[PDB]
Design an enzyme around this catalytic site. Structure first.
Site, PDB file in Angstrom:
ATOM      1  CE1 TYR A 144      -3.850   2.193   0.335  1.00 26.40           C
ATOM      2  CE2 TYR A 144      -2.873   3.093   2.067  1.00 26.40           C
ATOM      3  CZ  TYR A 144      -3.809   3.274   1.089  1.00 26.40           C
ATOM      4  OH  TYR A 144      -4.841   4.081   1.191  1.00 26.40           O
ATOM      5  CG  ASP A 214       5.645   3.449   1.189  1.00 24.83           C
ATOM      6  OD1 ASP A 214       6.102   4.108   2.279  1.00 24.83           O
ATOM      7  OD2 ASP A 214       4.521   3.341   0.723  1.00 24.83           O
ATOM      8  CE  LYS A 242       2.156   5.255   8.523  1.00 29.96           C
ATOM      9  NZ  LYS A 242       0.705   5.734   8.750  1.00 29.96           N
TER      10      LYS A 242
END
EC number: 5.4.3.8
Lengths: 402, 393
Positions: A144, A214, A242
């Site tokens: 994702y 990623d 994050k």
């Protein structure tokens, strides 16, 4: 175990927002249907609107690696906001966080801050195509990288080098590059097999294609320098998020200088972010990284998480439940299938029915796990040995049933 | 006028980030290339890393409508952060803001919060296609079809040229990204009619106009209701935020309610909700928008009157606390007209204003913004600076 207030709030939310949430996963539909509304979080805990306290293993999905509401991060934010919440112009904080990031991540020589992992992955997909002049991109099933729209997307099984080589052969001079989570967390926890990352590095170089990591989830968690540093494989570009925001909306993408030079206003690739480089977001991220720089940080994370994972696996055995899992630093996974799990296909062999009952039981024992079998779990510097013992005692109780 | 620290910091920035900035426009490329580095902002002012104070007309691009670092917003944030900066799960604050947004915006009956105007517009373009089953979308200059802003005929032409292919039309009901440009009479109405005529969606990007042009935005102000609208900036109180909503049945397609996938790990952030809720409450106080129209009308008029007296060709205009000032005689109806502006003059004007203690958007193609914190005296001083600068040029 009362969840009346949560049901009340959630019920009302469904008439105001789609499915009553800001993000699909929060709806619990994959592990029950009745989510719990949070009121506050601190250290390794979170509290219901009903007063129930939980030992949290979601850490708001990765940012809370130093624990929820770290006193130093909050104090830093208190001071910073007196100066204003947003400038819309450059500020020194941006230079500091950028310098810290460049020093931390092996492949990053130049960075661009954005507001989410989605924006970062979106922008990196574009530099990839812009820099190489090629349009097709290779990604792995189960991975994702935000909800960015992306016929130009080729997919392959995670951990499958030969499938990757095949795609290059079938599309000569059309592959801009390969993007992936060097360690998967969005289709359960999945580590790369020996030689997989290196192989991806070899073939991308062979075809003048870009290797993009990623690390929105693994960055600053698996290691200070992330997976790339940890496993010694350096990509051309990598996304972050994050943790570098310490709780606030943040994201970033960077890598080789000559590639980043294509980003406006340095280069022609247009990417804008009106509220990017937010001073509060920069402040929390800086403080969070400094904290991660203290002694024994990653050793402590691996320590308590290895014990957690193993125990979970030992308990599944003793209770007669098929299972497999694993952990690297403060990131782990636990599947209800004997596995092992190497890709999304394997992961899906998991007994979702059982996971659902397990997740709810744990909830009733005061433990809050990701409301999905296809999500990695997280630990933090705030989790105590006692929290781990309590989580394992809970696991036994729940699994002793099932 | 010393900018030594800003120069040092910006110089170092270019070896760390693309163009030494987080957003292209901050590089000052179209206005000299010597950006100023902010240290702090308060009320209607901004302060340099060199200690220079400016009367700010950028308001971090719209969020600071009630002034920079408003005491009540900051107090609300301090109180909220003791509870954690992010949950990753539902919280009551989301319901509060969502409900306030629904009550405020005519077309919104259901909202989904995201983290930027970019994510919202990105999601709205997707519901448009998903919901109509069509792939082409019409946007305006300044699968993508483009047309001149304020050109109903150019739009009709696109529909005829692509029967059953247009999912809809998306635009800023009032332009701010290619300079300030108001919609001509009948334009927005026209768009409503033709979209309805072809079962196409009408989408308003009110990220910049929302809660600024009016509590209900342009759609409320000008009496034209779209099917979907994107929001941002103000609803975040300065923190990264975004949102998209509209007709209930269209929003039902959004996951987990529907099949159209869109997610945001940090969406619905409690700090952003808190700051957004407090900003909207402050805007609900007496005479807010009347005040913004009062000072902004005076500013704009004076800016135009001054250009006249100094012999400079110019045009502009303002609606609520949003305005524009072009160095061309105009009028400006679209991007093409906006581009006739004397960018060379604007640059000199922009720098001279900086020197007079006034911070304007570093570009001719950006609307200006005022806040409730701007006092009559700030406006006086701004015009006084405007004359000094334009008396030269």
């Amino acid at each position: 175990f009362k969840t009346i207030k949560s049901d009340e709030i959630f019920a009302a939310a469904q008439k105001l927002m789609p499915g009553g949430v800001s993000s699909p996963v929060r709806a619990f539909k994959s592990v029950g249907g009745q989510p719990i509304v949070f009121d506050r979080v601190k250290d390794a805990y979170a509290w219901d609107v009903d007063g129930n306290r939980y030992i949290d293993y979601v850490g708001t999905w990765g940012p809370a690696i130093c624990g929820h509401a770290h006193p130093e991060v909050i104090e830093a934010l208190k001071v910073a906001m007196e100066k204003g919440t947003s400038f819309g112009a450059p500020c020194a904080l941006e230079n500091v966080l950028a310098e810290m990031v460049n020093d931390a991540v092996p492949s990053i020589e130049m960075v661009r801050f954005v507001n989410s992992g989605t924006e970062a992955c979106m922008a990196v997909l574009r530099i990839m195509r812009a820099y190489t002049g090629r349009d097709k991109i290779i990604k792995f099933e189960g991975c994702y990288h935000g909800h960015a729209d992306m016929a130009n997307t080729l997919t392959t099984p995670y951990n499958d080098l030969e499938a990757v080589k095949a795609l290059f052969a079938e599309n000569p001079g059309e592959i801009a590059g390969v993007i992936l989570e060097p360690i998967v967390g969005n289709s359960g926890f999945i580590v790369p097999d020996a030689g997989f990352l290196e192989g991806l590095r070899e073939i991308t170089l062979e075809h003048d294609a870009l290797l993009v990591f990623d690390e929105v989830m693994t960055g600053f968690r698996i290691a200070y320098g992330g997976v790339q540093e940890k496993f010694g494989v350096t990509p051309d570009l990598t996304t972050l998020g994050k943790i570098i925001g310490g709780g606030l909306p943040v994201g970033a993408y960077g890598g080789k200088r000559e590639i980043m030079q294509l980003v406006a206003p340095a280069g022609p690739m247009y990417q804008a972010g009106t509220l990017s480089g937010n001073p509060l977001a920069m402040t929390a991220g800086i403080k969070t990284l400094e904290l991660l720089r203290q002694p024994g940080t990653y050793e402590y994370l691996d320590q308590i998480t290895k014990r957690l994972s193993d125990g979970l696996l030992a308990i599944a055995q003793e209770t007669g439940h098929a299972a497999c899992g694993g952990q690297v630093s403060g990131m782990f996974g636990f599947f209800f299938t004997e596995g092992p799990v190497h890709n999304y296909e394997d992961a899906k062999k998991s007994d979702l029915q059982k996971f659902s009952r397990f997740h709810r039981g744990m909830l009733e024992q005061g433990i809050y796990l990701a409301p999905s079998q296809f999500e990695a779990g997280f630990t933090s510097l705030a989790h105590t040995e006692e929290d781990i013992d309590a989580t394992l005692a809970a696991a036994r109780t729940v699994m002793s049933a099932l």
